Design a protein around this ligand. Structure first.
Ligand SMILES: [Mg+2]
Ligand SMILES: [Mg+2]
Ligand SMILES: [Mg+2]
Ligand SMILES: [Mg+2]
Lengths: 204, 196, 196, 242, 222, 249, 244, 241, 231
């Protein structure tokens, strides 16, 4: 009984040409038993998106805690938090519980509102920043997502092609994992527009 | 690890090897296991490197404060500080210390603090893994009030035999001589003590 | 084990809880009511370790009633479920976690909508059209997936719950001594007196 | 020992008043006047700056109107630092309520929390109270639009139109004269501007000497803190300036 | 991880690979493992990367505060002592193994610190998984004198031995040179010998390959 | 034992806070220190009044770096300013850098120091700080900024302002000579002209301390390799630069 | 202004702490106690007022011992002296526990001085109403110290405090002038008996019992012991003969 | 009334307790000066033993804080020893935590911050003492840094402290205006000791014996205090002029 | 005048006025005398009543089988000090199997009382004690004052009009110091001593309290008819 393997779920973020993409599966289960087909794992604060995969209760607590922190940050600084600052905040918040960790693998994705640079990043249970400009995968099907993203990704993709790439990656990674699937959501994030798309998957 | 400290007519001499291993791998082959806690009070460390380093740092701090307030500390005072640090924390420490000091009152003195935090004042002390192999030789060759040359030769032969038989001990042989003149540093390389 | 089922049927939420309390090889009770009315329009059924269940349920009940008295306003079922989830997510990382799983059924008068939330002892909250805690789910979930309709009436929900309870009595290796069924709708919370 | 120097801030007077509370009220009575008006479709806050100079950067300045969350704002009268301390505590309490219930905190709950903090400061601890009066303008889906006021004593009251700070008597007289229940947000803006222009101690009311804010209704509620250019525009529209 | 440090005639250089792995899977193919404690005091990390990053950032913040308080350039021995005591306080439960080099008013310094608080001094040091290969190269090619270019070549060759002969190290080579008097030179990707070969085909899908059930525009506005 | 668990600053029957006004009075008797905001940087200047000429003036720096982009000057009690700059440097890390990986903006550091001072004016058994601070900073999203922090805990953004003895006259001078189109060199020149009136003794680079928050200095980073890290914007003008700008008045 | 003497640790406009001076006034009203540093050690002596013959003679000991080598006598508020002696015993015990060796006399002196000075730092604590003459023999020889209610302590060739302190000091000065070579242990005991007998003349209304202790390297092997039995009677006879 | 009893602001913005502590600094009526050489630093203080019953070796207002830092105090000996113990503890803790000897200015800043704390806190009184730390810092050379009960601290080319401090200060100012340097162009520390003693004799107008002075010399990695015989030899060498 | 607000303030003459007010609180208490020989120690107590319907309170408290005390002044402070003394005797007997000496008991009560005459807020104790005991050193009588001064005496008396009893004990010293082996004669001597302090009162069976400790006599209290034979 591994906490990061009880509920399951997958999140994958990718970068394109002046855009990003972040996708997750919609399954929440208890070992073999599947419970919720509508458990989304991506939450946005201002314009920075965060996908949390792992123990579902820790996912929800981190979502609420980061909403708390980003709201207070906007109230104090009078500006929305940027993806890099939010990544550092997630790292610090995760490491603050070094010996009582959250069993989650957060992934940050966004576009810096001042520089327009696409920025994605990933963490472990204790907040090790993985700053990769190509793709960031997390969840129970982390190896399948790694293989699909390493085989499919090419730099500087338009949103219409980045969507297809990330969707195929997540779909073919979820079909080879028992604890992942049951639906999928993909956010294609540009500087002035963010499109949410529900995918069609096999429900097994 | 193979460490020792021998008193003699003019003072004291500490000796050690320079091999620090993590298992079967020699992590460091130029380790200085002779640590100065006061001008003429040094220590040979064996066991946990982190534990011995922290204990030596705290003892040096306490002895510096002692020197600042009440003047120069005795070798027995440093031995007592080591004993207190090692005994009150015996459950979380693996440190064998050999405190060697020189003062004009008692010439050279050697105390040993093994596991558990007991203090023992001896004419000469040996510790570490390699020490297990030289008990007989040292007991049959040690003499009271030796000269500096004979003490250096005795320590060199003992530590060379220890390095030869103990796999955990090796490298160069380091020595610190504490006498009325002051502190002298000596090094003996493998090509020399291996042919002994 | 304990049987805790719930189903949301367009106009109301129906909660069914086993009547059996067994400690060892003895069925101590066959008429237990495993629910606590948190608010006039919000009920919560519970199952888990002995003592933890009733203690947690009555604690949540006292807190919800205190809020209702202080604000003279009934909390929405969503806020009640969030409060329960926060308490359970604080419990797991405490010294002795509450080993309680809850099904919260409530009719939101503001939105005029029935809502059913499932939370486990870890703090995993999910809004479901139908939910079940424990091995009961392994038999009820698929049955509902085949027979549930979002546009169902309270009577259709009662028939569906009768079918679920029959399947459980058939295939479960335990005699839960029947179920107590309660309906939560715009007119509040009532108990079905006549059930199979 | 130390009792010779203890001022005893939390003691009663023979009449039945708290010395420090009355003295903090007297202190606030010399602060810049702030006015809140609750119309049928919005709430309006307006305040006058005491710290006024030609070299004072008014763009990045915030000394009278502050945000508590996305639906509640506060007009301050008195010590700005104590006000910001209490505003930080209020923001933290609002976010705690949000994390606990996943709903925005109602206005009266936050007002009562802040007022209970200010009250506890006047009963125990032996510390001076916060010399700050607050006008809370908020919205929630239970009571709609809400205007509250709190003083250092810890008491809070609900209002339709209210004023705090200096010249509260004349401001309240003007409000009671020119307030109507069915008025709209623009009429409330005009009335607040007129009351500030008639109760000010300076010659004329210029944009750089006042702060303005509106909480109004896309089906969602928007909370707008007016920028200096928008304040100048509303002043030249209302007729106070040209 | 493979990290090395070599002292030359007028300073010290540190070098590291750029591969961070979660088990047998390569997580980051270009992880910068050279961290900055002070502008002229750098450190390479190994072990729990989160622990290394956190302890390095903490000690760097404390070093900056200490330098602002004392109005003096930070000393390598200060960061050494602080890291040593902080790691010893946790009895090795902070899995950070660092090679800390730098220059200060006292001169050039190079030390190694282990997770339990043990420290070691030397003219050439190596840590990480591929440490044994790098140390072999060092023992085979290190001499006293050593110019700046000689020390850079030695450190790069050691990191390459770790990149080729160890499975936990790979990809590129980060270097940081620190001479007495000059500024710290941070050569990111000083060598890139593992450039990925071009694929035989492009796997871009025709638009419309993925079936979409529901689409909407989410509001990132105020 | 601290039996002073009660406030030493209480409201007088007239509404005044006695200790606040007395700290402000102590500030008014301090040496004149001014600050001027330009369009490409801010300047903060003060007079280095030395008690004995045997004392080394360089070891008495009235301008102190808080963050690599934020500096501060004061008027009032030196030791209070020193402990305040130490607390500010510490809070810049413990409350922002260690949480967001970046240094705080100017307004936030000013608010933190103001909170410290407000606690000092309300906590038990403590007197307020006898200093007024001028904090000059630059952040990426708010540009350049100049703030004044008073012992009461209140802070105000200023285009230009002075505090101290001749503060009134200096502020009048600035109001007459300040414009929203000023450059950093023009601001330094106006600051020198303003400090020339508040001082009567020697007026050279060794008697006045002036610093600027302007462009980034890659030459003061201490390391080269990271293109994103440009350099610190705070820079204290050397005595030679001050003398070269004074000789051209 | 006024009222600077109402709270402790309040600087008066002339730079004084009047509470310390009032503690000194309380000290001056106490009995006479002296200390004499001889060649191989130190001797302490004190006068005990026999207000009534109901007091059990040779009991009610005033001279206290710290560790096994420190002797302490005090003039002023006897309970404050006992409190200070208990604190000093704690300090000596801690010093022996940490550094093995018995605490040196200067170290003990500085410990007591820091304690008293800290007691003159806060208005929530009253200054000590005792002046303490202490000392003993350590590895560096004999040491004698006097510590005031102000926390100020110094090393003395001879020290005296109490009502007749002035007379005692004069006699002590004679001892410094007439004997530059130094006194022996028993010689210092006899001269201390003489000095106490002469100092009692300032309190002739009551009778007094002389109490003497000594810490000498040659006579007591560096240990603090009460001069009792034959030597005490010898010193008493010498004092009564040297007096008229 | 009560505003002159605790460390709170008077209506004039003044702290009367701090000024009264400054007054208390002169309670001992002893002057001491400090000067810097090519590679050393000398402090000289007046040694007044009024009582014949006193041990002259124990009458000292100079303290060896560390092996490199010395401190001469003007003020009562209780507060003097308090500050000395605190400075020794701070130096030891610094050497332990940061791995190098505590610099002179850093110790001065620490003691001045503690003085500022005593000045802002009303529960404790300021220490009525003036502390002059002297050392040969590895990065600054000969260094003299003085701190006062107000919490202020500053370095000096040379300094003086005591009742007759202004006369010695004026003498040193005149000598340094004439010599046009900020130190004593002498190689040996003995000559700097002689210079300091000579200039104090000239400023105060009084001769000194070997039992009337206390001399503290700070050289590279060693601070010491001269014995009566070394002071006597320096006085003989000054008499040879 | 302006220096009796607390124990933390010395007077210009060097006095502690709160300690003196506690001593005066003792002087307004009923008289109690104590005496001892070489084999026994007796405490006689004149118990005081409020009126004829009231009781005469209690002045004798046992601290251990070998040690006891009589009080004069505030009864609760005497209860606190007696509880501390019982706890110290119990600690000695348990940890060391050693009956606590009387001199050390006086030292510990001296320290306990001094701890209040220097800290603000904590008033001095308003009671005076007469402690009798028999230990390895023989019989012991101690007088404890709240100033902290504890004095070992052959006989003494504390309370109102105690000077008459003190002078009587002074005159009868050579007589009562030799009453060894006969406790009844020592008790009658104490009764005469306490009678010397009766101006308009007379000893009855309800106002007289006796306490005896000795060689083969543990600390025992006699009240009522038990004291009649001594009246
Ligand atoms: Mg699957
Ligand atoms: Mg399936
Ligand atoms: Mg070997
Ligand atoms: Mg490899």
């Amino acid at each position: 009984s591994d906490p990061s393997s009880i509920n399951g779920g997958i999140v994958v973020a990718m970068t394109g040409k002046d855009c990003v993409a972040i996708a997750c599966d919609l399954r929440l289960g208890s070992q073999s038993l599947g419970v919720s087909n509508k458990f989304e794992k991506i939450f946005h604060y201002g314009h920075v998106f965060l996908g949390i995969t792992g123990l579902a209760t820790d996912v929800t607590t981190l979502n609420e805690m980061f909403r708390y922190k980003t709201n207070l940050y906007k109230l104090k600084e009078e500006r929305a938090i940027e993806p890099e600052t939010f990544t550092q905040l997630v790292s610090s918040s995760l490491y603050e519980r070094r010996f009582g960790p959250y069993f989650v693998g957060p992934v940050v994705a966004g576009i810096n509102s001042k520089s327009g640079k696409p920025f994605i990043a990933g963490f472990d249970l204790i907040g090790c920043i993985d700053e990769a400009k190509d793709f960031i995968v997390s969840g129970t099907a982390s190896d399948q997502l790694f293989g699909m993203c390493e085989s499919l990704y090419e730099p500087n993709l338009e949103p219409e092609d980045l969507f297809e790439t990330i969707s195929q990656a997540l779909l073919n990674a979820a079909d080879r994992d028992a604890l992942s699937g049951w639906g999928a959501v993909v956010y294609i994030i540009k500087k002035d527009e963010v499109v949410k798309r529900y995918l069609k998957m096999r429900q097994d | 690890t193979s460490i020792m400290a021998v008193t003699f007519k003019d003072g004291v001499i500490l000796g050690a090897d320079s091999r620090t291993t993590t298992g079967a791998y020699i992590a460091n082959r130029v380790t200085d296991k002779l640590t100065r806690v006061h001008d003429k009070i040094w220590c040979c460390r064996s066991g946990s490197a982190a534990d011995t380093q922290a204990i030596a740092d705290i003892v040096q701090y306490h002895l510096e404060l002692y020197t600042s307030q009440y003047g120069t500390p005795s070798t027995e005072t440093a031995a007592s500080v080591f004993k207190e640090l090692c005994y009150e924390n015996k459950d979380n420490l693996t440190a064998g210390i050999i405190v060697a000091g020189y003062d004009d009152k008692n010439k050279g003195e050697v105390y040993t603090i093994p596991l558990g935090g007991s203090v023992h004042k001896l004419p000469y002390a040996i510790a570490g893994s390699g020490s297990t192999f030289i008990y007989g030789y040292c007991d049959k060759n040690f003499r009271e009030n030796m000269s500096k040359e004979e003490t250096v030769d005795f320590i060199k032969h003992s530590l060379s035999q220890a390095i030869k038989w103990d796999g955990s001990s090796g490298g160069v042989i380091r020595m610190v001589v504490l006498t009325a003149a002051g502190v002298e540093r000596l090094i003996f390389y493998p090509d020399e003590y291996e042919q002994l | 084990m304990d049987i805790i089922l719930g189903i949301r049927v367009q106009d109301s939420v129906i909660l069914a809880s086993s009547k059996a309390v067994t400690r060892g090889i003895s069925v101590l009770k066959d008429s237990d009511d495993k629910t606590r009315q948190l608010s006039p329009h919000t009920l919560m059924s519970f199952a888990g370790e002995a003592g933890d269940t009733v203690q947690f349920a009555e604690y949540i009940q006292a807190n919800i009633q205190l809020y209702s008295i202080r604000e003279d306003y009934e909390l929405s079922p969503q806020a009640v479920s969030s409060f329960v989830r926060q308490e359970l997510a604080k419990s797991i990382r405490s010294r002795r976690p509450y080993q309680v799983n809850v099904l919260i059924g409530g009719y939101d008068k503001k939105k005029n909508k029935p809502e059913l939330y499932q939370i486990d002892y870890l703090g995993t909250k999910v809004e479901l059209p139908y939910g079940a805690h424990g091995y009961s789910g392994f038999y009820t979930f698929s049955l509902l997936d085949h027979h549930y309709r979002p546009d169902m009436t309270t009577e259709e929900g009662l028939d569906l719950l009768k079918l679920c309870v029959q399947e459980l009595e058939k295939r479960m290796p335990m005699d839960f001594k029947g179920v107590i069924v309660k309906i939560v709708d715009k007119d509040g919370i009532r108990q079905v007196d006549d059930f199979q | 020992g130390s009792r010779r120097y203890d001022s005893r801030t939390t003691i009663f007077s023979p009449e039945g008043r708290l010395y420090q509370v009355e003295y903090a009220l007297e202190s606030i009575s010399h602060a810049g006047t702030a006015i809140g008006i609750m119309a049928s479709d919005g709430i309006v806050l307006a305040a006058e700056r005491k710290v006024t100079s030609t070299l004072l950067e008014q763009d990045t300045s915030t000394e009278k109107l502050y945000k508590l969350n996305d639906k509640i704002a506060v007009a301050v009268a008195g010590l700005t630092a104590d006000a910001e301390i209490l505003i930080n505590t209020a923001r933290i309490h609002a976010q705690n309520y949000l994390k606990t219930y996943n709903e925005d905190i109602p206005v009266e709950i936050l007002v009562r929390r802040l007022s209970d903090i200010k009250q506890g400061y006047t009963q125990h601890g032996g510390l001076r109270p916060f010399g700050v009066s607050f006008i809370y303008a908020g919205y929630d889906d239970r009571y709609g639009y809400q205007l509250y006021t709190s003083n250092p004593s810890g008491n809070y009251t609900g209002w339709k139109a209210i004023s705090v700070g200096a010249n509260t008597s004349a401001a309240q007289t003007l409000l009671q004269m020119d307030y109507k229940d069915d008025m709209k947000v623009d009429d409330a803006i005009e009335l607040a501007l007129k009351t500030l222009s008639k109760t000010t101690d300076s010659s004329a009311l210029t944009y750089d000497r006042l702060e303005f804010a509106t909480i109004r209704k896309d089906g969602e509620v928007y909370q707008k803190i007016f920028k200096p250019q928008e304040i100048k525009d509303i002043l030249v529209k209302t007729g106070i300036t040209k | 991880t493979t990290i090395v440090g070599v002292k030359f005639n007028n300073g010290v250089v540190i070098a590291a690979d750029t591969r961070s792995t979660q088990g047998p899977i390569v997580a980051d193919k270009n992880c910068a493992k050279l961290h900055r404690i002070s502008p002229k005091i750098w450190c390479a990390g190994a072990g729990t990367a989160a622990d290394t990053e956190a302890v390095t950032q903490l000690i760097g913040s404390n070093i900056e505060l200490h330098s602002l308080y004392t109005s003096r350039e930070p000393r390598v021995v200060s960061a050494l002592q602080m890291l040593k005591q902080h790691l010893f306080k946790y009895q090795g439960h902070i899995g950070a193994y660092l090679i800390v080099a730098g220059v200060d008013p006292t001169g050039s310094h190079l030390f190694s610190i282990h997770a339990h608080g043990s420290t070691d001094v030397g003219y050439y040091l190596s840590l990480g998984s591929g440490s044994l290969a790098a140390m072999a190269v060092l023992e085979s090619h290190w001499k006293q004198d050593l110019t700046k270019e000689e020390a850079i070549k030695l450190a790069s060759d050691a990191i390459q031995a770790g990149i080729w002969n160890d499975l936990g190290s790979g990809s590129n080579v980060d270097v940081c040179v620190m001479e007495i008097g000059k500024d710290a030179e941070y050569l990111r990707n000083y060598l890139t010998p593992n450039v990925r070969e071009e694929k035989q085909k492009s796997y871009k899908f025709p638009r419309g390959t993925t079936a979409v059930l529901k689409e909407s525009i989410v509001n990132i506005c105020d | 034992t601290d039996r002073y668990s009660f406030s030493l600053t209480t409201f007088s029957p007239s509404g005044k806070l006695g200790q606040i006004d007395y700290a402000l009075t102590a500030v008014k008797q301090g040496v004149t220190s001014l600050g001027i905001k330009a369009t490409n940087g801010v300047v903060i200047a003060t007079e280095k009044k030395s008690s004995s000429p045997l004392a080394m003036s360089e070891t008495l720096s009235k301008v102190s770096l808080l963050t690599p982009d934020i500096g501060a000057v004061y008027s009032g009690m030196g030791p209070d300013y020193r402990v305040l700059v130490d607390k500010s440097r510490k809070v810049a890390h413990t409350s922002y850098k260690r949480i967001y990986g970046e240094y705080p903006p100017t307004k936030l550091l000013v608010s933190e120091v103001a909170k410290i001072m407000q606690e000092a004016t309300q906590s038990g058994g403590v007197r307020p700080f006898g200093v007024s601070l001028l904090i000059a900073g630059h952040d990426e999203f708010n540009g350049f900024s100049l703030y004044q922090v008073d012992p009461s805990g209140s802070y105000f953004p200023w285009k230009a302002t002075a505090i101290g003895k001749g503060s009134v006259a200096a502020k009048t001078f600035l109001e007459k000579r300040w414009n929203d189109e000023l450059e950093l060199e023009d601001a330094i020149h106006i600051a020198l002209l303003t400090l020339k009136e508040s001082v009567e003794g020697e007026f050279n680079g060794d008697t006045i301390e002036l610093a600027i928050i302007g462009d980034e200095n890659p030459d003061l980073l201490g390391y080269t390799g990271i293109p994103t890290d440009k350099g610190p914007r705070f820079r204290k003008l050397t005595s030679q630069e001050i003398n070269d700008r004074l000789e051209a008045l | 202004g006024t009222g600077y003497d109402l709270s402790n640790s309040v600087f008066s406009p002339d730079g004084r702490n009047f509470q310390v001076e009032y503690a000194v006034k309380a000290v001056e009203n106490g009995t006479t106690s002296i200390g004499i540093k001889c060649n191989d050690g130190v001797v302490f002596a004190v006068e005990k007022l026999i207000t009534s013959k109901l007091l059990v003679p040779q009991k009610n000991v005033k001279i206290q011992v710290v560790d096994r080598h420190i002797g302490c006598v005090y003039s002023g508020l006897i309970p404050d002296g006992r409190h200070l002696v208990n604190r000093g015993r704690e300090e000596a015990a801690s010093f022996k526990k940490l550094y093995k060796t018995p605490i040196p006399i200067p170290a003990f002196a500085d410990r007591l001085g820091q304690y008293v000075q800290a007691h003159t730092l806060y208005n929530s604590v009253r200054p000590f109403g005792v002046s303490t003459i202490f000392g003993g023999v350590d590895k560096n020889g004999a040491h004698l110290y006097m510590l005031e209610p102000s926390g100020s302590y110094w090393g003395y060739k001879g020290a005296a405090t109490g009502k007749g302190r002035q007379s005692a000091k004069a006699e002590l000065e004679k001892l410094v002038d007439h004997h530059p070579e130094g006194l022996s242990a028993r010689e210092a005991v006899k001269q201390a008996a003489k000095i106490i007998y002469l100092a009692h003349e300032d309190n002739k209304e009551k009778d007094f019992e002389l109490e003497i202790s000594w810490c000498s390297l040659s006579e007591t092997n560096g240990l603090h012991k009460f001069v009792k039995g034959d030597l005490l009677q010898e010193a008493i006879d010498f004092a009564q003969k040297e007096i008229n | 009334g009560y505003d002159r009893h605790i460390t709170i602001f008077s209506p004039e913005g003044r702290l009367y307790q701090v000024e009264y502590a400054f007054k208390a600094t002169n309670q001992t009526n002893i002057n001491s000066l400090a000067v810097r050489g090519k590679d050393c630093t000398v402090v000289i203080s007046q040694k007044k033993v009024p009582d014949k019953l006193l041990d002259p070796t124990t009458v000292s207002y100079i303290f060896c804080i560390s092996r490199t830092i010395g401190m001469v105090v003007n003020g009562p000996i209780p507060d003097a020893r308090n500050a000395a113990l605190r400075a020794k503890a701070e130096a030891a803790e610094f050497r332990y935590k940061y791995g190098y000897d505590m610099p002179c200015d850093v110790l001065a800043k620490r003691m001045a911050n503690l003085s500022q704390i005593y000045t802002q806190r009303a529960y404790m009184r300021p220490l009525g003492v003036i502390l002059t730390f002297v050392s040969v810092d590895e990065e600054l050379g000969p260094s003299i840094y003085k701190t006062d009960p107000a919490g202020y601290y500053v370095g000096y080319k040379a300094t003086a402290t005591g009742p007759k401090q202004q006369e010695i200060t004026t003498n040193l100012e005149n000598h340094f205006k004439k010599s046009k340097i900020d130190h004593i162009n002498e190689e040996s520390w003995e000559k700097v000791v002689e210079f300091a003693i000579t200039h104090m004799i000239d400023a105060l107008g009084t001769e000194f014996s070997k039992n009337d002075l206390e001399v503290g010399v700070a050289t590279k990695d060693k601070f010491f205090t001269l014995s009566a015989e070394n002071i006597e030899e320096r006085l003989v060498a000054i008499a040879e002029q | 005048n302006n220096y009796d607000g607390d124990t933390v303030t010395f007077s210009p003459t060097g006095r502690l006025f709160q300690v003196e007010y506690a001593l005066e609180a003792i002087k307004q208490g009923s008289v109690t005398v104590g005496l001892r020989s070489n084999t026994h120690a007796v405490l006689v107590a004149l118990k005081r009543n409020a009126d004829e319907l009231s009781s005469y309170q209690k002045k004798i408290i046992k601290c251990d089988e070998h040690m006891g005390l009589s009080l004069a002044g505030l009864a609760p402070d005497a209860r606190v000090l007696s509880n501390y003394l019982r706890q110290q005797c119990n600690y000695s007997s348990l940890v060391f199997n050693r009956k606590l000496a009387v001199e050390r008991a006086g030292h510990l009560l001296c320290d306990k009382a001094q701890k209040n005459t220097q800290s603000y807020g904590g008033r001095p104790y308003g009671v005076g004690l007469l402690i009798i005991g028999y230990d390895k050193s023989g019989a012991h009588l101690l007088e404890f004052q709240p100033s902290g001064n504890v004095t070992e005496l052959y006989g003494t008396a504390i309370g109102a009009r105690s000077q008459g009893a003190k002078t009587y004990l002074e005159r009868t010293l050579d007589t009562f110091i030799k009453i060894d082996g006969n406790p009844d004669e020592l008790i009658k001597a104490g009764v005469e001593a306490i009678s010397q302090s009766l101006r308009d009162e007379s000893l009855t069976v309800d106002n007289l309290s006796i306490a005896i400790v000795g060689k083969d006599t543990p600390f025992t209290i006699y009240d009522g008819e038990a004291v009649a034979k001594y009246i």
